[PDB]
Amino acid sequence: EDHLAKELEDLNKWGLNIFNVAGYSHNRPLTCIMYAIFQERDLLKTFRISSDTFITYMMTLEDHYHSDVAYHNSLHAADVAQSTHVLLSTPALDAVFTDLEILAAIFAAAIHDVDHPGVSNQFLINTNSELALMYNDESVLENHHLAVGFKLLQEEHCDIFMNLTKKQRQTLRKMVIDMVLATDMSKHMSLLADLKTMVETKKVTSSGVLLLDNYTDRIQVLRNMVHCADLSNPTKSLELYRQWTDRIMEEFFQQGDKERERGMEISPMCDKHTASVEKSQVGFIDYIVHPLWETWADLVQPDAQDILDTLEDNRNWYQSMIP
Ligand SMILES: COc1ccc(/C(C)=N/OC(N)=O)cc1OC1CCCC1
Numbered sequence: 495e496d497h498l499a500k501e502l503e504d505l506n507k508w509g510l511n512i513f514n515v516a517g518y519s520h521n522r523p524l525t526c527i528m529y530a531i532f533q534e535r536d537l538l539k540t541f542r543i544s545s546d547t548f549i550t551y552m553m554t555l556e557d558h559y560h561s562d563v564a565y566h567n568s569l570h571a572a573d574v575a576q577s578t579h580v581l582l583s584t585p586a587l588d589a590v591f592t593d594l595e596i597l598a599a600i601f602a603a604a605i606h607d608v609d610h611p612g613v614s615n616q617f618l619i620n621t622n623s624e625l626a627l628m629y630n631d632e633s634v635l636e637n638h639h640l641a642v643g644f645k646l647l648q649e650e651h652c653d654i655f656m657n658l659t660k661k662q663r664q665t666l667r668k669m670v671i672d673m674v675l676a677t678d679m680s681k682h683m684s685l686l687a688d689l690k691t692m693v694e695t696k697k698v699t700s701s702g703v704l705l706l707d708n709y710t711d712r713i714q715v716l717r718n719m720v721h722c723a724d725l726s727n728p729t730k731s732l733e734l735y736r737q738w739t740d741r742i743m744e745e746f747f748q749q750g751d752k753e754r755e756r757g758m759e760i761s762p763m764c765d766k767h768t769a770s771v772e773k774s775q776v777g778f779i780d781y782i783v784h785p786l787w788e789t790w791a792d793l794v795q796p797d798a799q800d801i802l803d804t805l806e807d808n809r810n811w812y813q814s815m816i817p
Pocket residue numbers: 679724725727728738739742743746763774775778
Protein backbone atom coordinates (compact mmCIF):
# COMPACT_ATOMS: atom_id res chain seq x y z
CA GLU A 495 0.00 0.00 0.00
CA ASP A 496 2.40 2.69 1.27
CA HIS A 497 5.03 -0.02 0.62
CA LEU A 498 3.76 -0.47 -2.94
CA ALA A 499 4.05 3.24 -3.79
CA LYS A 500 7.58 3.27 -2.31
CA GLU A 501 8.63 0.33 -4.45
CA LEU A 502 6.97 1.81 -7.55
CA GLU A 503 9.05 5.02 -7.16
CA ASP A 504 11.69 2.89 -8.95
CA LEU A 505 9.34 2.05 -11.92
CA ASN A 506 11.78 3.65 -14.44
CA LYS A 507 14.80 1.99 -12.83
CA TRP A 508 16.65 -1.27 -13.30
CA GLY A 509 16.76 -1.66 -9.49
CA LEU A 510 12.95 -2.01 -9.29
CA ASN A 511 12.22 -5.08 -7.13
CA ILE A 512 9.31 -6.99 -8.72
CA PHE A 513 9.11 -9.58 -5.92
CA ASN A 514 8.21 -6.72 -3.58
CA VAL A 515 5.52 -5.41 -5.93
CA ALA A 516 3.98 -8.89 -6.20
CA GLY A 517 3.76 -9.14 -2.37
CA TYR A 518 1.85 -5.83 -2.12
CA SER A 519 -0.46 -6.38 -5.15
CA HIS A 520 -2.25 -9.62 -4.12
CA ASN A 521 -0.07 -11.71 -6.40
CA ARG A 522 -0.99 -9.64 -9.42
CA PRO A 523 2.48 -8.23 -10.30
CA LEU A 524 1.76 -8.28 -14.07
CA THR A 525 -1.52 -6.40 -13.78
CA CYS A 526 -0.05 -3.87 -11.34
CA ILE A 527 3.19 -3.22 -13.24
CA MET A 528 1.43 -2.99 -16.61
CA TYR A 529 -1.00 -0.47 -15.23
CA ALA A 530 1.84 1.61 -13.68
CA ILE A 531 3.85 1.49 -16.92
CA PHE A 532 0.91 2.45 -19.14
CA GLN A 533 0.06 5.48 -16.92
CA GLU A 534 3.67 6.64 -16.74
CA ARG A 535 3.89 6.60 -20.58
CA ASP A 536 0.38 8.02 -21.08
CA LEU A 537 -0.51 5.05 -23.29
CA LEU A 538 -4.11 4.82 -22.07
CA LYS A 539 -4.77 8.43 -23.13
CA THR A 540 -2.78 8.10 -26.38
CA PHE A 541 -4.50 4.98 -27.66
CA ARG A 542 -7.98 5.72 -26.09
CA ILE A 543 -7.85 2.53 -24.04
CA SER A 544 -10.44 2.46 -21.25
CA SER A 545 -8.98 1.59 -17.80
CA ASP A 546 -11.68 -0.98 -17.03
CA THR A 547 -11.02 -2.71 -20.35
CA PHE A 548 -7.25 -2.68 -19.77
CA ILE A 549 -7.51 -4.10 -16.24
CA THR A 550 -9.94 -6.81 -17.34
CA TYR A 551 -7.58 -7.88 -20.15
CA MET A 552 -4.50 -7.73 -17.93
CA MET A 553 -6.15 -9.69 -15.11
CA THR A 554 -7.42 -12.35 -17.50
CA LEU A 555 -3.96 -12.49 -19.13
CA GLU A 556 -2.27 -12.78 -15.73
CA ASP A 557 -4.64 -15.54 -14.65
CA HIS A 558 -3.52 -17.45 -17.76
CA TYR A 559 0.07 -17.67 -16.44
CA HIS A 560 0.30 -20.77 -14.21
CA SER A 561 0.85 -20.10 -10.53
CA ASP A 562 2.33 -23.62 -9.87
CA VAL A 563 5.15 -23.16 -12.39
CA ALA A 564 8.27 -21.98 -10.54
CA TYR A 565 9.80 -19.57 -13.03
CA HIS A 566 7.49 -19.03 -16.02
CA ASN A 567 4.60 -17.51 -14.02
CA SER A 568 3.21 -13.93 -14.08
CA LEU A 569 6.11 -12.57 -12.01
CA HIS A 570 8.54 -13.31 -14.85
CA ALA A 571 6.24 -11.70 -17.39
CA ALA A 572 5.94 -8.69 -15.08
CA ASP A 573 9.78 -8.56 -14.83
CA VAL A 574 10.26 -8.76 -18.56
CA ALA A 575 7.64 -6.02 -19.11
CA GLN A 576 9.22 -3.63 -16.57
CA SER A 577 12.72 -4.30 -17.92
CA THR A 578 11.51 -3.59 -21.46
CA HIS A 579 9.96 -0.41 -20.14
CA VAL A 580 13.38 0.70 -18.83
CA LEU A 581 15.32 -0.29 -22.00
CA LEU A 582 12.91 1.64 -24.21
CA SER A 583 14.10 4.78 -22.34
CA THR A 584 17.83 4.18 -22.95
CA PRO A 585 19.23 7.63 -23.95
CA ALA A 586 20.64 6.23 -27.22
CA LEU A 587 17.09 5.31 -28.35
CA ASP A 588 15.49 8.66 -27.48
CA ALA A 589 12.56 9.41 -29.81
CA VAL A 590 13.50 6.66 -32.24
CA PHE A 591 10.28 4.70 -31.71
CA THR A 592 6.68 5.64 -32.44
CA ASP A 593 4.12 5.34 -29.66
CA LEU A 594 2.69 2.28 -31.48
CA GLU A 595 6.13 0.54 -31.34
CA ILE A 596 6.52 1.37 -27.65
CA LEU A 597 3.03 -0.06 -27.05
CA ALA A 598 3.86 -3.29 -28.97
CA ALA A 599 7.13 -4.03 -27.18
CA ILE A 600 5.66 -3.74 -23.68
CA PHE A 601 2.50 -5.62 -24.75
CA ALA A 602 4.75 -8.28 -26.26
CA ALA A 603 6.71 -8.61 -23.01
CA ALA A 604 3.51 -8.97 -20.95
CA ILE A 605 2.10 -11.83 -23.06
CA HIS A 606 5.42 -13.37 -24.10
CA ASP A 607 5.22 -16.52 -21.88
CA VAL A 608 1.46 -16.82 -21.18
CA ASP A 609 0.11 -20.30 -20.40
CA HIS A 610 3.67 -21.65 -20.10
CA PRO A 611 3.47 -25.25 -18.72
CA GLY A 612 6.91 -25.29 -17.12
CA VAL A 613 8.55 -27.63 -19.60
CA SER A 614 10.65 -26.87 -22.66
CA ASN A 615 9.81 -26.95 -26.40
CA GLN A 616 11.99 -30.08 -26.73
CA PHE A 617 10.09 -31.86 -23.95
CA LEU A 618 6.79 -31.02 -25.67
CA ILE A 619 8.20 -32.37 -29.00
CA ASN A 620 9.64 -35.62 -27.49
CA THR A 621 6.43 -36.48 -25.57
CA ASN A 622 4.25 -35.90 -28.69
CA SER A 623 2.26 -33.27 -26.83
CA GLU A 624 -0.83 -31.72 -28.35
CA LEU A 625 0.98 -28.36 -28.54
CA ALA A 626 3.84 -29.84 -30.61
CA LEU A 627 1.37 -31.60 -32.93
CA MET A 628 -0.52 -28.33 -33.36
CA TYR A 629 2.59 -26.23 -34.14
CA ASN A 630 4.58 -28.81 -36.13
CA ASP A 631 7.58 -28.69 -33.73
CA GLU A 632 8.49 -25.06 -34.57
CA SER A 633 8.72 -22.49 -31.77
CA VAL A 634 5.97 -24.49 -30.08
CA LEU A 635 5.59 -22.52 -26.82
CA GLU A 636 6.09 -19.12 -28.45
CA ASN A 637 3.43 -19.62 -31.14
CA HIS A 638 1.22 -20.75 -28.25
CA HIS A 639 1.91 -17.61 -26.08
CA LEU A 640 0.97 -15.41 -29.04
CA ALA A 641 -2.18 -17.35 -29.88
CA VAL A 642 -3.47 -17.05 -26.31
CA GLY A 643 -2.61 -13.38 -25.91
CA PHE A 644 -4.23 -12.41 -29.20
CA LYS A 645 -7.22 -14.77 -28.59
CA LEU A 646 -7.97 -12.91 -25.37
CA LEU A 647 -8.20 -9.62 -27.33
CA GLN A 648 -11.23 -11.06 -29.28
CA GLU A 649 -13.97 -10.38 -26.67
CA GLU A 650 -15.32 -6.77 -26.75
CA HIS A 651 -14.93 -6.43 -22.94
CA CYS A 652 -11.17 -7.21 -23.42
CA ASP A 653 -10.18 -5.49 -26.69
CA ILE A 654 -7.72 -2.84 -25.52
CA PHE A 655 -6.79 -2.06 -29.15
CA MET A 656 -10.41 -1.32 -30.17
CA ASN A 657 -9.69 2.38 -30.69
CA LEU A 658 -6.53 1.85 -32.73
CA THR A 659 -6.67 2.32 -36.49
CA LYS A 660 -7.13 -0.82 -38.66
CA LYS A 661 -3.65 -0.28 -40.08
CA GLN A 662 -2.32 0.33 -36.55
CA ARG A 663 -3.74 -3.05 -35.37
CA GLN A 664 -2.08 -4.82 -38.36
CA THR A 665 1.30 -3.16 -37.71
CA LEU A 666 1.14 -3.87 -33.97
CA ARG A 667 0.17 -7.49 -34.56
CA LYS A 668 3.02 -7.96 -37.02
CA MET A 669 5.51 -6.42 -34.56
CA VAL A 670 4.25 -8.40 -31.56
CA ILE A 671 4.41 -11.75 -33.38
CA ASP A 672 7.96 -10.88 -34.48
CA MET A 673 9.01 -10.02 -30.90
CA VAL A 674 7.60 -13.07 -29.12
CA LEU A 675 8.86 -15.53 -31.73
CA ALA A 676 12.28 -13.96 -31.14
CA THR A 677 12.21 -15.08 -27.45
CA ASP A 678 12.66 -18.74 -28.56
CA MET A 679 16.18 -19.58 -27.37
CA SER A 680 16.85 -21.77 -30.44
CA LYS A 681 16.98 -18.50 -32.47
CA HIS A 682 19.44 -16.84 -30.05
CA MET A 683 22.65 -17.30 -32.09
CA SER A 684 20.92 -16.03 -35.24
CA LEU A 685 19.52 -13.01 -33.41
CA LEU A 686 22.93 -12.21 -31.89
CA ALA A 687 24.76 -12.50 -35.24
CA ASP A 688 22.24 -10.06 -36.75
CA LEU A 689 22.56 -7.68 -33.82
CA LYS A 690 26.37 -7.66 -34.22
CA THR A 691 25.97 -6.71 -37.89
CA MET A 692 23.66 -3.81 -36.96
CA VAL A 693 26.25 -2.64 -34.41
CA GLU A 694 28.92 -2.85 -37.17
CA THR A 695 27.01 -0.43 -39.42
CA LYS A 696 25.62 1.70 -36.57
CA LYS A 697 24.90 5.32 -37.43
CA VAL A 698 24.00 8.15 -35.01
CA THR A 699 23.04 11.81 -34.91
CA SER A 700 25.73 14.25 -33.75
CA SER A 701 24.14 14.04 -30.25
CA GLY A 702 24.69 10.27 -29.85
CA VAL A 703 21.21 8.98 -30.74
CA LEU A 704 20.79 5.98 -33.04
CA LEU A 705 19.52 6.46 -36.56
CA LEU A 706 17.17 3.67 -37.61
CA ASP A 707 16.08 4.12 -41.22
CA ASN A 708 13.36 1.60 -42.07
CA TYR A 709 10.85 -0.47 -40.23
CA THR A 710 13.36 -3.36 -40.64
CA ASP A 711 16.04 -1.81 -38.45
CA ARG A 712 13.60 -0.57 -35.78
CA ILE A 713 11.93 -4.00 -35.37
CA GLN A 714 15.32 -5.74 -35.25
CA VAL A 715 16.30 -3.55 -32.26
CA LEU A 716 12.89 -4.11 -30.59
CA ARG A 717 13.15 -7.91 -31.10
CA ASN A 718 16.58 -7.83 -29.49
CA MET A 719 15.48 -5.52 -26.71
CA VAL A 720 12.73 -7.92 -25.65
CA HIS A 721 15.22 -10.83 -25.86
CA CYS A 722 17.71 -8.99 -23.58
CA ALA A 723 14.88 -8.24 -21.12
CA ASP A 724 14.11 -11.94 -21.13
CA LEU A 725 17.77 -12.71 -20.42
CA SER A 726 18.14 -9.84 -17.97
CA ASN A 727 18.09 -11.81 -14.68
CA PRO A 728 21.95 -11.93 -14.34
CA THR A 729 22.19 -8.16 -14.94
CA LYS A 730 20.05 -7.30 -11.89
CA SER A 731 21.25 -7.01 -8.26
CA LEU A 732 22.67 -10.21 -6.78
CA GLU A 733 19.71 -10.52 -4.35
CA LEU A 734 17.22 -10.46 -7.29
CA TYR A 735 19.39 -12.62 -9.56
CA ARG A 736 19.67 -15.40 -6.92
CA GLN A 737 15.88 -15.59 -6.43
CA TRP A 738 15.52 -15.86 -10.23
CA THR A 739 18.14 -18.65 -10.28
CA ASP A 740 16.36 -20.59 -7.52
CA ARG A 741 13.13 -20.44 -9.54
CA ILE A 742 14.54 -21.58 -12.87
CA MET A 743 16.38 -24.51 -11.25
CA GLU A 744 13.23 -25.56 -9.44
CA GLU A 745 11.43 -25.53 -12.79
CA PHE A 746 14.26 -27.31 -14.65
CA PHE A 747 14.69 -29.99 -11.97
CA GLN A 748 10.92 -30.66 -11.97
CA GLN A 749 11.24 -31.17 -15.76
CA GLY A 750 14.08 -33.62 -15.14
CA ASP A 751 11.86 -35.47 -12.64
CA LYS A 752 9.11 -35.75 -15.28
CA GLU A 753 11.71 -37.01 -17.80
CA ARG A 754 13.03 -39.71 -15.41
CA GLU A 755 9.48 -40.88 -14.54
CA ARG A 756 8.82 -41.51 -18.25
CA GLY A 757 12.12 -43.32 -18.94
CA MET A 758 13.32 -40.52 -21.24
CA GLU A 759 16.84 -39.18 -21.52
CA ILE A 760 17.35 -36.59 -18.75
CA SER A 761 18.43 -33.18 -20.06
CA PRO A 762 21.81 -32.50 -18.25
CA MET A 763 21.00 -29.10 -16.67
CA CYS A 764 17.62 -30.52 -15.63
CA ASP A 765 19.18 -33.42 -13.69
CA LYS A 766 18.99 -32.64 -9.93
CA HIS A 767 21.43 -35.48 -9.00
CA THR A 768 24.36 -34.19 -11.12
CA ALA A 769 23.90 -30.56 -12.20
CA SER A 770 25.81 -27.78 -10.47
CA VAL A 771 23.56 -24.75 -10.07
CA GLU A 772 26.64 -22.49 -9.80
CA LYS A 773 28.52 -23.89 -12.81
CA SER A 774 25.38 -23.64 -14.87
CA GLN A 775 24.94 -19.90 -14.21
CA VAL A 776 28.59 -19.23 -15.03
CA GLY A 777 28.14 -21.01 -18.39
CA PHE A 778 24.83 -19.24 -18.97
CA ILE A 779 26.59 -15.89 -18.41
CA ASP A 780 29.75 -16.66 -20.40
CA TYR A 781 28.18 -18.25 -23.49
CA ILE A 782 24.81 -16.52 -23.71
CA VAL A 783 24.02 -13.57 -21.48
CA HIS A 784 27.32 -11.68 -21.59
CA PRO A 785 27.89 -11.99 -25.36
CA LEU A 786 24.37 -10.67 -25.91
CA TRP A 787 24.63 -7.78 -23.42
CA GLU A 788 28.14 -6.87 -24.58
CA THR A 789 26.61 -6.43 -28.03
CA TRP A 790 23.58 -4.49 -26.67
CA ALA A 791 25.98 -2.20 -24.74
CA ASP A 792 27.94 -1.48 -27.93
CA LEU A 793 24.70 -0.50 -29.71
CA VAL A 794 23.61 1.93 -26.96
CA GLN A 795 27.00 2.90 -25.47
CA PRO A 796 27.68 4.04 -22.89
CA ASP A 797 24.12 3.66 -21.44
CA ALA A 798 24.48 -0.01 -20.48
CA GLN A 799 27.95 0.00 -18.86
CA ASP A 800 26.55 -0.29 -15.29
CA ILE A 801 24.50 -3.35 -16.39
CA LEU A 802 27.66 -4.92 -17.79
CA ASP A 803 29.55 -4.21 -14.54
CA THR A 804 26.80 -5.83 -12.45
CA LEU A 805 26.86 -8.83 -14.80
CA GLU A 806 30.60 -9.37 -14.33
CA ASP A 807 30.28 -9.06 -10.55
CA ASN A 808 27.39 -11.57 -10.42
CA ARG A 809 29.34 -13.95 -12.65
CA ASN A 810 32.33 -13.86 -10.32
CA TRP A 811 30.12 -14.45 -7.27
CA TYR A 812 28.65 -17.66 -8.77
CA GLN A 813 32.19 -18.68 -9.82
CA SER A 814 33.44 -18.12 -6.25
CA MET A 815 30.69 -20.46 -4.96
CA ILE A 816 32.07 -23.35 -7.08
CA PRO A 817 34.76 -25.36 -5.24
C1 LIG B 1 18.48 -17.43 -13.84
O1 LIG B 1 18.86 -18.26 -14.93
C2 LIG B 1 18.13 -18.44 -16.08
C3 LIG B 1 17.15 -17.53 -16.43
C4 LIG B 1 16.43 -17.70 -17.60
C5 LIG B 1 16.66 -18.79 -18.43
C6 LIG B 1 15.86 -18.96 -19.68
C7 LIG B 1 16.77 -19.25 -20.86
N1 LIG B 1 14.86 -20.00 -19.48
O2 LIG B 1 14.79 -21.18 -20.31
C8 LIG B 1 14.36 -21.08 -21.70
N2 LIG B 1 14.94 -21.85 -22.63
O3 LIG B 1 13.46 -20.28 -21.97
C9 LIG B 1 17.63 -19.71 -18.08
C10 LIG B 1 18.37 -19.54 -16.91
O4 LIG B 1 19.34 -20.44 -16.56
C11 LIG B 1 19.49 -21.72 -17.19
C12 LIG B 1 19.47 -22.76 -16.10
C13 LIG B 1 20.92 -23.08 -15.78
C14 LIG B 1 21.78 -22.29 -16.74
C15 LIG B 1 20.85 -21.81 -17.84
